Amino acid sequence: SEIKILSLNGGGVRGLFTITLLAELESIIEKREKCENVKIGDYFDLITGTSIGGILALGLASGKSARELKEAFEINATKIFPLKRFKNKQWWNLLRRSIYESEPLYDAVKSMIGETIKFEDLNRRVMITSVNLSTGKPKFFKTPHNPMFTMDREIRLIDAAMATSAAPTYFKPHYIEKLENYFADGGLVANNPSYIGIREVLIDMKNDFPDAKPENIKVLNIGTLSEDYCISPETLSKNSGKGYLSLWNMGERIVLSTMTANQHLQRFMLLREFEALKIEKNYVEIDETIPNEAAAEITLDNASEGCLKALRGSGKKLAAERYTKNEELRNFFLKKAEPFVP
Amino acid sequence: SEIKILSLNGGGVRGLFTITLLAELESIIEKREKCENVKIGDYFDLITGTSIGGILALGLASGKSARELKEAFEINATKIFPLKRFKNKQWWNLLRRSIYESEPLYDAVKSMIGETIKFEDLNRRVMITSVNLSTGKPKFFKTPHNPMFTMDREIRLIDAAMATSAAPTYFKPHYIEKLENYFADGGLVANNPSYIGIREVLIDMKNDFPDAKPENIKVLNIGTLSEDYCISPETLSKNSGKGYLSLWNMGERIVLSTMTANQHLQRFMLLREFEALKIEKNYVEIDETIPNEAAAEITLDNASEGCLKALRGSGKKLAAERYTKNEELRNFFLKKAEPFVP
């Protein structure tokens, strides 16, 4: 059999790029393939996600079309990342509190999915990647698709969604009152959750797929136009010594370089594995650098009209063009996936 | 065959435990097996490492016995992490410059391995993990044991050792003049290089081992008594949502939590793979815990006499017990690994 994973990296409004590309793909299937009420989340056996990619993954698994999620994201993007706090980062504010507030993000997630939906009422398998800053171990909020691992059953989807999106500096750690633990962003370990998703499909989801091999797994890793993040050599040369706050810019650069490094490492591991089995074709990634953007101005948070317009245009153009040429992006949506019964 | 990998985690001062355990193992080998001039690094076909573990791995790969490295570390644990800078962190100091200086660490690394030795002069394969903050991609300083990857041939060992130990907020990023790039700690990507070490052996070390499987790989992953790191529940309950400077202690806690989470995730993946292939015996770990210290009290840069004594005693005791009972540890030092020739 064929197993399809939908990996969604996390980048903030670059998540809006991700959801715009997904919605455009949905509309393309609706038009060309002659379908009605098509959801982009019904064609995948597992929907992995991290940070806002994880929020979108939970939205897709809960049974909502990518277009409704895109509308909610468009409505709530400026609320999640207000310019009032974006322009007043400085350092005398970052020392007393984190950037932004969890409440606008919480309300955005509540609008997207809801508040009373739990992992036990989901018809599709989903991962949420997070770091549990109370035991020191990462926490993977997955659906009860493995009988040996059936916790998170009584955990609301919004709790996991806020856990994965809590960037260490850009937000505050999310308190899950059920477990009496706090959680941080999943990008601290896996900003590209394709590799851990493949591992889960191979060794965890074995009741659903007893005969699972790497050669029969297809991953659709929708990037966030932030793969090639780096620190510009100018601020490095001017701050590699003591550092006039530009190196490790109140922890923002620590977090961003960490997430970029783990994403690169996991992508490297996945590509090397697929080349080892000569299944390099099985990995489909949609991510291209913006031609007008240098690889240093990539920000986790930018709700300005220009950045949102660039993300929207890139998503639409990339979706249309990749569906036109990339045969595998079309092949991903030939057949629907089978819902899982816990 | 039997491929043996010696992976050493990164803990800063807590590498004193690693080097003490290795030196004690050398001593027991000399006493029991009646050998003369034993180098603990002569029994492994690959010596990965990260941070101070990477420095120790470079020392062992350069041909030094673990006792010479232990003496050098005895002097340079105080000479590297001065009590003055460890007691003078506060908030207005770490705001301007990174704690400690790279020059004491550079002098220490020069004292152990040297300054004029490059990766092409080594007789044993070695990978050192680091994060390149100029391209944003992880950089694995490795010997030219694969003809396809050689660009580390003309790089001094001291440059790699200083790059892998440049813990963010703990040391300034290391500048390599040959590559015109800046590097950070390898614990951001892989604090436990055992998994990536096995990946390297399977996918890269194929010229020497064309027939490589997970079954014939044995990993001796020596920890640093810092696996069970976590944020104190009191600190979170006080200023997790509040986000005061205690939470994310000027990047110290961000980096430490990232190291702990990366180590946990990589160890979890390795253990899951070995359980899948029923080769759990292959992975040998001598990472115990200190039974007289809080989990949240694990620090990366505490070189006080009490902590050094605790690390030394733990290393000696663990070496004694694990040589007495663990037969795999004895199996490691049976036959010397053949040196590799480029």
Automatic annotation (TrEMBL), chains A, B:
Annotated GO MF terms: hydrolase activity
Motif (GXSXG): 49-53
Record keyword Lipid metabolism present: yes
Active site positions: S51 (nucleophile), D185 (proton acceptor)
Domain of life: Bacteria
Keyword Hydrolase: yes
CDD domains: Pat17_PNPLA8_PNPLA9_like (cd07199)
PROSITE patterns associated with the record: PNPLA
UniProt motif GXGXXG: location: 10-15
Motif segment (DGA/G): 185-187
Keywords tagged on the record: Hydrolase, Lipid degradation, Lipid metabolism
InterPro entries assigned to the protein according to its UniProt record, in alphabetical order: Acyl_Trfase/lysoPLipase, PNPLA_dom
GO biological process: lipid catabolic process
Residues of the PNPLA domain: 6-198
PANTHER family reported in the protein's UniProt record: XYLOSE ISOMERASE (PTHR32176:SF92)
Family listed: Belongs to the patatin family.
Protein name, per record: CGAMP-activated phospholipase CapV
